[PDB]
Every structure is written in structure tokens, then in C-alpha cells.
């Protein structure tokens, strides 16, 4: 699936969830690979420089839909600000939104090449993995990687109240709905934004359930993979499994903060229209 994001007024971006998880997986697979032995720690510069080049490349492809993106932003600003006939206008949103999704599909093979180049690099690093004793492989790399890349993110989650955040959003949608049922082009605009807000909410709860589930799993699993040794084949399986958990967690965390901002930007417009409608009585 593809997620459209409007974090601020005038900006519109997208994320292909499968590609993000995929890129994230091979990033953490790459870091686990070099942090296993003290000798390869210094390789972080090259790994950092390669991931930066993969990301800058993927973005250059995204930017090829920029003219089709900007043409959709112009239509959105018209829809959200009906101040200087809704069905004839709603077609301009659909077609341009479809033209934007269609542009992204037409660059599928181009994005797939970059993802496959990151898969190649990540796998080739993972293959350089070796132990001093194949029956007694150290887990210092797993511990270091987690402490330096994942633990801070696990804390930011535990600090913030995602379940409360969801309920505050649930309270906005329910307060908006009873006010909405007082209409006697503006009511049709309010109906559309409210609908888009319920869709954003459902994506926010979906990712929140992934964040909470993956946070618990990671805290439980990490205890079992550190402060002990594994046989080589077991250590390799552990590294591949942990990275999958990290990628799903980091993707949902990333999408949640973006959708959270998308919800409150659309709320600002909803409140301005409601405020205009109440003033005119």
C-alpha cells in the first residue's frame, strides 16, 4: 500500500510502506553485520555513506512525480479553502489524485532497482559475518546495535501516550460529527474533510497497534539474544529475525508521526470552515 501525507499547509508527500520496511530492514541488517566484531566497527562511515546514496537515489525518483504532485496540491488548497458546486469539483480531486498514484506506479521498476541494490549491499555485508569460535559467537553486536539505534526509539514510544493521542483524535471526530449534523458547498466540504480525517485516524490506530505490539516483542526478545553466546547458524537466524521486528516497528513509528500531523493540519481547515459557517449562521 501507498500512504499520502500532508504534514503542513502546501506540502504533500507519499510513502510506499513495503519499500520503507524493506530499506529499513537492510539498513539494520547492515549495522548488525559490522558491529558483530570490534575489528569492523570502523566500517560505519562506508555503511552510512552507502545508505545516504541509496536514499538520495530513491528520492530523485519520487521527485519525478513533483509536477503531478504540485498540480494535486493546487486542487487540495481549492478544496480546503472554498473562499475566493461540489460534485463537479470532487472530480478534479479524484482524477488528479489518480494521476499522482498512476505516476508513482509508472516508476515501480525504478524504485525496485534501488531497493534491490540496498538488498544486495545488506546481504553481502551479512555474509561477511564470522565468529572466533563458530559454537560460541558473541552477541555484543546485537546489544550495541540495539543500545545505539533502537533503545532511544523504544523510550520515545513509552514516554508518549499513543493510546491517549488516539482518544484525543477520537474526541475531535465525535465532537465534529454532532456539530456536522447542523447544516440548516461548505457542508459538502466539511463532509469530505471529516471523511478524510476518519481514514487518517484508522491508519493512525493501525500503526499504533503495530508500534505497541512490536515494542513489547523487542523488549522481550532482546533480553534472550544478549549476555550469552550462540552457535553461528543460531546467531545468523537471530540477527535476521530481530531486523524484521525493528523494520516493522520503525516503519509504523515513522508513518504514525506523519499521519498524526496530517490529521491536525486537516483539522485546522475543518475548524476554519465550521467557524465560517457558524458566523454566517
Amino acid at each position, epitope marked *: 500500500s501507498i500512504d499520502i501525507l500532508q504534514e503542513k499547509e502546501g506540502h504533500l508527500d507519499f510513502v510506499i510502506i513495503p519499500h520503507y520496511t524493506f530499506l529499513e530492514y537492510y539498513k539494520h541488517l547492515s549495522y548488525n553485520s559490522i558491529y558483530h566484531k570490534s575489528s569492523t566497527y570502523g*566500517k560505519y562511515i*562506508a*555503511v552510512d555513506a*552507502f545508505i545516504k*546514496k*541509496i536514499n538520495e*537515489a530513491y528520492d530523485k525518483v519520487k521527485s519525478k512525480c513533483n509536477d503531478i504532485k504540485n498540480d494535486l496540491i493546487k486542487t487540495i488548497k481549492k478544496l480546503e479553502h472554498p473562499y475566493d458546486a461540489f460534485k463537479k469539483m470532487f472530480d478534479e480531486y479524484n482524477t488528479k489524485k489518480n494521476k499522482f498514484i498512476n505516476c508513482i506506479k509508472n516508476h515501480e521498476n525504478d524504485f525496485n532497482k534501488i531497493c534491490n*541494490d540496498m538488498k*544486495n*549491499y545488506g*546481504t*553481502n*555485508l*551479512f*555474509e*561477511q559475518l*564470522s565468529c572466533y569460535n563458530n559454537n560460541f559467537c558473541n552477541t555484543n553486536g546485537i546489544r550495541y546495535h540495539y543500545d545505539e539505534y533502537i533503545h532511544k526509539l523504544i523510550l520515545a514510544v513509552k514516554s508518549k501516550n499513543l493510546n491517549k493521542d488516539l482518544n484525543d483524535m477520537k474526541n475531535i471526530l465525535q465532537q465534529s460529527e454532532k456539530l456536522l449534523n447542523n447544516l440548516e458547498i461548505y457542508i459538502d466540504t466539511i463532509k469530505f474533510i471529516h471523511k478524510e480525517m476518519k481514514h487518517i485516524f484508522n491508519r493512525i490506530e493501525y500503526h499504533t497497534k503495530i508500534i505497541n505490539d512490536k515494542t513489547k516483542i523487542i523488549q522481550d526478545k532482546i533480553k534472550l539474544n544478549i549476555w550469552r553466546t550462540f552457535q553461528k547458524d543460531e546467531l545468523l537466524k537471530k540477527i535476521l529475525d530481530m531486523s524484521k521486528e525493528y523494520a516493522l516497528f520503525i516503519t509504523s513509528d515513522h508513518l504514525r508521526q506523519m499521519l498524526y500531523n496530517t490529521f491536525y493540519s486537516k483539522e485546522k481547515h475543518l475548524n476554519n470552515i465550521f467557524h465560517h459557517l457558524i458566523y454566517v449562521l
Partner: antibody, heavy 121, light 112 residues
Framework: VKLVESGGGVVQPGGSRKLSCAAS????????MAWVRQAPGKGPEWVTF????????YYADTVTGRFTISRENAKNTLHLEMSSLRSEDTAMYYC???????????????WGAGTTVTVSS | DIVLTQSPASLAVSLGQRATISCRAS??????????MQWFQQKPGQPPRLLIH???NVQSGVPARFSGSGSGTDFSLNIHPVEEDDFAMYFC?????????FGGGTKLEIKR
């Protein structure tokens, strides 16, 4: 740091042959491995490649479906099973060690002395 | 497939001079800011010997008199000053796209 190929000789057309390469003076599992061949009076032709744990296996279009690369890491050995051999397969077959550069690429830094395969009736 | 064309096919030089060998790829050999061009040396009845790998990175143990330059599609091997040990065949090789291809070779010969 040495690579030594074995198994070369005269094979009849349509016949089969297995080549071996023994590695020494380094951790064999630390490297990608490849076979490169050189036809009499010609330049080198890359045949096949195998990554450290055999996750990547590549073949030149000239040998695909006829040749099979494999490695036995505990034995420090690289293998090449060749089948339905033709006169065009007559060459010096080299075993070469591949290094994965952190800029994201493979390069061949150590080569063996080679073993000749002559495909003739 | 990426075609590598070496120029000249044969080059004759005297001891102490500069030998410049050119390699031109049909497609770009760039891979995220790195040109994946290798240079090899080969003497009769001997295997190839790696000289340069990152279009520019001199192999450990390879004398400083060897250098590589270029990017994208145009590459150069420089030997300065040429010594007796250097008369051999030189091949460029790309590791950007499979099949990994070599050039046709340039023979470095002694002028007499």
C-alpha cells in the same frame, strides 16, 4: 595466500568435467569466489561467481544451464561442474578470490595458476 | 552487455617513459559515486594480477608508478616511469553489471 586449481585435462565434446580449487593462507569463508577462463590467444572471460555463504550465484550467458559453481567452506574448496562441453569451452580456467568493497562492489584480487581444459575428439 | 574497448591495441615504449592506456565502456560503470573499473596485468603463461580496483585505488603491494583515472565511461591506466617488469598485457574489467566483462587488452612492449 594461494589458490590451486585441479581437475583439468582432455574432455571429448558433449562430455562432462569437474574442476576444483584449493584455497590456503586465508579464511575461505571471508570471500566471494569466481571462475574466469582464458581461451588460447584471447583475453579473460568471467564464467561464474559465488558469494561467501552462496546467497549470490551468477553465471555468464555462455555457460548458464551447463555449468554449476559450488563451495565447501569447511574444506576451503571451490568447485565447477561442467557439462555438455564444446570446443569453445577450451581454455585455461582460473579460480579467483572476490573482495566485497564497502562502496558496494566485488573485485578479484587473488588468482590461481589455472588448470587447462581441452575439449576435443 | 557492457563492452570495454581498450586503446591502443599495442603500445611500444622505452624504459623510464610514460605509458598511457585507455579503456572505454559502452554503458556507464558508475555505481553510487564509484566507477567499478579494475585494471589487471598479465605476463605470458601467468595469471592476471590486480593493479587497480576503484578506477583509482592502487592495490596494496602494487608500485606507486601505477595509477588509474577516469569516471563514467572513460578510463586511463598510467605507468610512469616504465620499468622492465611492466612489459605485459593490460586488461580493464567492469563489475557494475553482470556479466562482468573485460577489455580486449593492450600489449605494453619495449621499443627497440
Amino acid at each position: 595466500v594461494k589458490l590451486v586449481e585441479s581437475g583439468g585435462g582432455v574432455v571429448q565434446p558433449g562430455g562432462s568435467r569437474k574442476l576444483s580449487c584449493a584455497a590456503s593462507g586465508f579464511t575461505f569463508s571471508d570471500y566471494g569466489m569466481a571462475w574466469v577462463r582464458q581461451a588460447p590467444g584471447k583475453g579473460p572471460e568471467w564464467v561464474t561467481f559465488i558469494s561467501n555463504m552462496a546467497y549470490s550465484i551468477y553465471y555468464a550467458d555462455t555457460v548458464t544451464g551447463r555449468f554449476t559453481i559450488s563451495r565447501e567452506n569447511a574444506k576451503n574448496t571451490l568447485h565447477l561442474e561442467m557439462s555438455s562441453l564444446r570446443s569453445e569451452d577450451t581454455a585455461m580456467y582460473y579460480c579467483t578470490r572476490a573482495i566485497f568493497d564497502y562502496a558496494g562492489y566485488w573485485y578479484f584480487d587473488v588468482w590461481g595458476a589455472g588448470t587447462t581444459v581441452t575439449v576435443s575428439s | 552487455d557492457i563492452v570495454l574497448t581498450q586503446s591502443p591495441a599495442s603500445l611500444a615504449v622505452s624504459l623510464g617513459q610514460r605509458a598511457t592506456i585507455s579503456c572505454r565502456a559502452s554503458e556507464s560503470v558508475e555505481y553510487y559515486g564509484t566507477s567499478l573499473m579494475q585494471w589487471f596485468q598479465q605476463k605470458p603463461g601467468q595469471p592476471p594480477r590486480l593493479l587497480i580496483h576503484g578506477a583509482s585505488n592502487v592495490q596494496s603491494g602494487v608500485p606507486a608508478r601505477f595509477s588509474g583515472s577516469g569516471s563514467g565511461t572513460d578510463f586511463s591506466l598510467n605507468i610512469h616511469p616504465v620499468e622492465e617488469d611492466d612489459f605485459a598485457m593490460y586488461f580493464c574489467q567492469q563489475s557494475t553489471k553482470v556479466p562482468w566483462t573485460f577489455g580486449g587488452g593492450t600489449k605494453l612492449e619495449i621499443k627497440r
